[PDB]
Symmetry: D2
Subunit: 369 residues, 4 copies
């Protein structure tokens, strides 16, 4: 049938990103304090508020986040990492999660558990058939956190916690994670590196972040060899490149693999107005990407698809990119993208030779059994 | 000798950009109000504050802005445009300058006059030999405003007001305006379209803004034919492309033309972290661009070079891009770019075939007499 | 017995565009520099809502959707000319001045004004029918300064008067009371019901804080309404002791004398210890005690029918805790401390000063005229 | 005769990192939501500076560069342990807690604390030598809560005491006065000079506003310093009438009795009508009159030697106009109105209430002990 779940929790908007821009404010470096860190939670809150103010919320089934348990977290992460996060969160003013930039406040583990747990709860309810699909608008994000660490503002790897739950608790034999956050999903890649039961795909700007990963030659290991697929694209790639990648690589990979559930790491940092990447995707591009992936799920896994928020750093534009994806889930297309004409004139809608060549990963599809 | 002028006026930081993102907030469109418009003056104020906090201010000669007179403005703009700006500024709550997006507050003409006048005052003092060079950190910007209108948040075309002053008041026969704001300097192009006495050069992202201009075929008209040079570059172009453009096109054009003064429209919206374009220039890239242009001025026009602020929309990073240019003027290189390693890993430092081909404008150099 | 507490929040209450000025607009000639957050910026009320959710109070509330106030609803409190002027201003391509030179609406800003008044109406309807026992409408923009024929003091429509008008005309209640404890005089509400004894209007406020020329004890209504408007102006620096003495000596006796069938509270928190727009010393515990007293009074005299409707309050730091205290008195679930309690308790306001006592006692002889 | 008015602003005064809390840090367990602007955010003082410039007052001032306070400078007001603790905290990779659990410094935040104290010192030196007639040091962080052995109340070092210590030890002045009209008790300054009659310390403040346990009239110094600390605690709601009565009856007579060779004013604007962190009713015209009186007193008794040093004040909207009024009294160029004047004048505070008069009169018998 048709019932679309939606997860927002007030505390997703209360993540304290501090007073720096990216790293902390630093007087010796003359990095002046600023009100809004690049990753400030207001960007995602504005998406939530637009979901409500547009009336999309009336077509969604609100789903309460339920805190991820230690057992849930341990399906994706090491005990040492979980214990370190408990340690850092218990410090009187929080602290450094290990990388020197990713911080948690005192009690910040509460929000990290609710973020991973929002993904799990939506996954559970879609997998059982209570819901047909859904969108978990979580924060903090997940895809940079590998098995043994926090990284890139990610405390736990939300989509991997959800995949682990689908595998262990729901008994699914095959799950796919499709990450279209513009940054390489190195954490997700790491977690399932040796494991063919979770197909991991990352469409991203080549070497945007991290600086040393996301190459096409990173394909997994052992029994997992062939079950990690990176699609690095050049800076300036737009809707044409992204849709060519979907049609030539992503959708064929999903059809070859036959997952029982598709989890999308849904970032909007590939947008035309994002500060933290150089891509040219518009809300109409994300719309088409979502439509294609939802339709693929309908064909191959009884429509079982869960979108989980990753990055995106335009408070101005991200809400409209997100809303387009929500509208593809609900089928209620009731608000225009007010930037559409303005951004459409900038380009990205022609498949350039260098973009085409980057996508033409195609010979690796044959190794997905 | 060596004396570097620097213009900042408090009111440059008081430009009211409203409560929208780009266009105004709009309830029917569900464009939620936001504290900082993309063009909020804090970005440029943070540059000023870094100039001070870094100690660069101790190596600069502060120059007070002096309001541009009607006569000054009329060297670049029509009487109808000036009168319309006086009209709009006199409205009790200001209003629409004509394009439906560019607004002035009540009394906002004061700031527009100080912005153009900051460029004029620095130009005067460099041309006389009181100063060797300088940087006018003005706001609002100028380069989109054509002869008969305000456009793209530009009320008056600051660099053209300064060029007009150099021509009419100082009696210079040849002036060059080099615009490296990432958006096409359509206003400047328009003003001097028929005029070979002001060479206008625009290095920009192709079709970023405006959507219908900046093509290589836009070359001026009449006696001005050959004295407008557009260098449109593809999205994703970085330091390699920008420096190749400098070496192959911009610097040869300046040497062919033999201006008596070089005015640089110094935007930083080509930076790696800018939301309003897709280019990959780092602070080190802007440093090298500035070094090259200052050295060219030393060779061909007795060092007479005036930098005038155009766009740039990263409050995080613009200050460091600007500071690099200031350091090239003063010769005091006392602060690192704290983002250098982070951004250097993202690329843009290899000249791609498509970038090289866009630059290879070279056959037009022969028409500069 | 029955317990179900309604709660109204609409996303658009947080989207009210207060501009780039502090109070009036930014002004270059006056050298009033633009600022991100106007004093009345919606974030203050949004932070209250978010605390209601993050504290877990939301799990004890029954969410009630705001329904846009119709023209008919608005016309029970305001003139046709005022409604038409608001439709006119809201239809202007970039909105404009609502009449006073400071209160503005955006293009389409009438949508939010309707949802604000309509949130009060919807909660009133559902409490009056017995679906709900009581509730809190966390609306924005506020209401109490808007008189019959105008917008004023960032109020477009007089939300509590629209709700009272609905209770009177649609539900057929013969007597309604509006108790306003916003720190500013409820001049709009006073104006609307000035000649009308069917809506008892009470305003507890800082004397001459805003507006400058109203809220005196001598403003008592007119005609058949004479005696059915009660102002309790208090001196600057009044705190919990003064506010509770006013409740016990004046407000609660007035309500008991009048026997309203519904009590509507204009629930502002601008009397708080940390508010920039008044000089009063009320703490979250003070508002808690005020709410408790008023809810208990409603239980005694009108079958518990009480509707709280948000008015002002300008501390984004502290207002959420003041508001949460009132919500907790409605739900009976007292699960979070006021983290400012010790800090503010040391500042005073907890002793009834002679001047405060005397200001309150000025109103006591007027209670006898409430029939 | 001579007229040259020094003015200190340093960009880094605007870069003080006040964090993401309201007052204490953001706290998830307490459900204190993060906020962009802490109550003490530097933008309030930066907006004052920008108004000094945009109003054209800057053209009538002599800009004076702040020079970092040396260890020797700091040690005239504070203990070696406190200085070493501040060097320790500032050297920590991400800074930390200065001791009280709320006052923090960033890594390298000692640089700004030194520039703040050093701005006061540099202006003091240049006024005392006769290079300047008077001046205003618009410093941040503030000073007056920091006692000899600690940081407190967002004060790292006691700027005015560092300046007084310099005047005493380096310039050889035998008598200095510090007049603090920040609305909070200058407990730090009181502590530093408690036993010392060579620095007369006066604090006009809201009674028990902050700290909670100090500022009583009975706190008069000790030993040879007995009689050389004067507290003037005023009740909440006191306005221009009370403040000017306190100036005329207590402050100015105390200064005339003491005959300081230099007057340092701890110039806070947190007594303003719109301040969130106190309940007083002073307007820009009130601060203007206070400044005029004090400058004229300096002209009469110490050859015009007066240095104003910024303390608190938490209205980004209104503080700039309060500060500008003081600057205009120094320059004598009165070129911009207070655009809030009419709005605030209607709220009151301009009548001397009996309780206000009595609070002030409590201090008058202590004037006789100033020898
Ligand atoms: O959306 C993001 N990723 O999907 C993002 F994490 F926020 C990021 F990639 F854009 C990021 F901002 F670049 C980053 F990863 F968070 C980051 F900035 F790169 C970082 F992680 F914070 C970071 O800079 N990490 C470093 C760690 C060690 C040494 C240098 C950098
Ligand atoms: O830095 C800039 N230019 O150098 C910029 F003007 F700010 C811009 F190009 F980035 C801009 F923001 F895109 C813009 F030009 F200002 C703008 F947004 F495009 C605009 F001018 F405001 C704009 O959108 N103008 C339009 C006018 C009519 C119809 C549609 C758009
Ligand atoms: O909470 C408030 N009222 O309950 C308040 F309206 F916000 C106010 F009273 F505090 C207010 F802010 F003071 C005001 F009422 F909004 C205002 F500021 F006074 C005003 F209404 F906007 C205002 O200043 N109005 C004026 C109208 C005409 C002439 C001068 C002032
Ligand atoms: O302007 C001020 N003083 O002149 C002020 F310091 F900011 C203050 F008094 F208003 C203050 F904000 F109240 C404070 F002093 F800063 C403070 F908030 F009270 C505090 F110091 F930070 C504070 O609350 N300190 C405490 C220390 C220990 C235990 C409880 C509170
Ligand atoms: K895998
Ligand atoms: K990815
Ligand atoms: K030309
Ligand atoms: K350009
Ligand atoms: K009445
Ligand atoms: K009231
Ligand atoms: K003393
Ligand atoms: K004081
Ligand atoms: Zn990302
Ligand atoms: Zn630009
Ligand atoms: Zn109010
Ligand atoms: Zn203070």
């Amino acid at each position: 049938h048709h019932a679309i779940g939606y997860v927002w929790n007030t505390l997703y908007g209360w993540v304290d990103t501090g007073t720096g821009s990216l790293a902390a404010a630093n007087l010796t470096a003359r990095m002046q304090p600023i009100s809004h860190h690049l990753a400030h939670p207001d960007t995602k809150r504005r998406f939530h508020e637009l979901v409500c103010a547009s009336g999309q919320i009336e077509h969604l089934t609100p789903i309460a986040a339920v805190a991820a348990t230690d057992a849930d977290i341990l399906r994706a992460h090491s005990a040492a990492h979980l214990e370190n996060m408990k340690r850092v969160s218990n410090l009187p003013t929080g602290g450094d999660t290990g990388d020197g930039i990713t911080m948690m406040g005192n009690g910040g583990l509460e929000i990290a558990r609710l973020s991973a747990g929002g993904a799990v709860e939506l996954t559970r309810r879609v997998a059982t058939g209570e819901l047909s699909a859904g969108y978990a608008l979580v924060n903090p994000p997940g895809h940079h956190a590998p098995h043994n660490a926090a990284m890139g503002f990610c405390i736990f790897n939300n989509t991997s916690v959800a995949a682990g739950y689908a595998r262990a608790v729901l008994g699914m034999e095959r799950v796919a994670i499709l990450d279209w956050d513009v940054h390489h999903g190195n954490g997700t890649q790491d977690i399932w590196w040796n494991d063919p039961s979770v197909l991991t795909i990352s469409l991203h700007q080549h070497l945007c972040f991290p600086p040393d990963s996301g190459y096409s030659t990173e394909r997994g290991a052992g029994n997992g060899h062939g079950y990690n697929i990176n699609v690095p694209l050049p800076p300036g790639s737009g809707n044409a490149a992204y849709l060519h990648a979907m049609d030539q690589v992503v959708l064929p990979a999903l059809r070859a693999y036959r997952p029982q559930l598709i989890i999308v790491g849904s970032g909007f940092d590939a947008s035309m107005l994002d500060p933290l990447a150089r891509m040219m995707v518009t809300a109409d591009g994300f719309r088409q990407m979502a439509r294609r992936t939802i339709d693929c799920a309908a064909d191959i896994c009884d429509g079982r698809i869960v979108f989980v928020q990753e990055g995106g750093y335009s408070p101005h534009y991200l809400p409209f990119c997100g809303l387009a994806v929500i509208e593809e889930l609900t089928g209620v297309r009731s608000l225009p993208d007010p930037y559409h004409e303005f951004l459409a004139g900038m380009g990205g809608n022609t498949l350039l030779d260098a973009e085409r060549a980057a996508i033409e990963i195609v010979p690796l599809l044959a190794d997905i059994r």
